[PDB]
Amino acid sequence: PWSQAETQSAHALFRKAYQRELDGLLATVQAQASQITQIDDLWKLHDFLSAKKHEIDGKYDDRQSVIIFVFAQLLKEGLVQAEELTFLAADKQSKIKALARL
Amino acid sequence: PWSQAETQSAHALFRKAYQRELDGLLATVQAQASQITQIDDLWKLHDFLSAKKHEIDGKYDDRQSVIIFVFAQLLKEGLVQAEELTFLAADKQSKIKALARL
């Protein structure tokens, strides 16, 4: 079903993708912040933060039975690339790449 | 008993204080958003932004039951100067200052 080395590297690229979305999030927040003029910009920021937080909290399900779909989402948002999925079994990669288009 | 002038000028002052708080809030946010290094300080900010927003929404209440307390507060937080209250009756000024000194 799931090789060990598979599971390991999976959790790895998982948390790496996490760190990536974190970097992007931080960059965007700092950017928006340093370039505000109106007060409405600040509330745009606020809304952005609530949304992104909500998203991220429920996004990164680490459980095995869902990891494929999580990976799929991450790929659909380009947080990872197909080239980074080579450490998996073939059926898994094809699965992910299929679930991506949904 | 609130005369027309007292109410009108009270609203003008309320708005003045509102814009002032907007400026201060803007300054603080714009500041600590440049002092971020870690990621958790991004959430503090958020929480701050999520707290201070709920405040400002329901802070400036012009109803008779609290208006004096609102002015007292706005006086403590330096959102209004004492000399801006001179349009009010003397008793009200006294009361506001009294609630503000504590």
Curated annotation (Swiss-Prot), chains A, B:
Entry's localization field: Cellular thylakoid membrane
Superkingdom, taxonomy of origin: Bacteria
Entry's induction text: Transcribed from its own promoter, it may also be cotranscribed with upstream ocp.
Effect of W43F: About 75% conversion of OCP-R to OCP-O
Pfam families: FRP
InterPro entries from the UniProt entry: Fluoresc_Recovery_Reg, FRP
Impact when changing W43L: About 25% conversion of OCP-R to OCP-O
Keyword tags: Membrane, Thylakoid
Topology in membrane: Peripheral membrane protein
Cellular component aspect of the GO annotation: plasma membrane-derived thylakoid membrane
Phenotype upon gene inactivation: Decreased fluorescence recovery after non-photochemical quenching (NPQ).
Assembly with partners or alone: Probably a dimer, interacts with the C-terminal domain of OCP-R.
Purpose: Destabilizes orange carotenoid protein-R form (OCP-R), the FRP-OCP interaction accelerates the OCP-R to OCP-O conversion. Increases fluorescence recovery following non-photochemical quenching (NPQ) by OCP, most probably by destabilizing OCP-R binding to the phycobilisome core.
Protein name as catalogued: Fluorescence recovery protein
Organism from which the protein derives: Synechocystis sp. (strain ATCC 27184 / PCC 6803 / Kazusa)
Lineage: Bacteria, Bacillati, Cyanobacteriota, Cyanophyceae, Synechococcales
Encoding gene, per UniProt annotation: frp
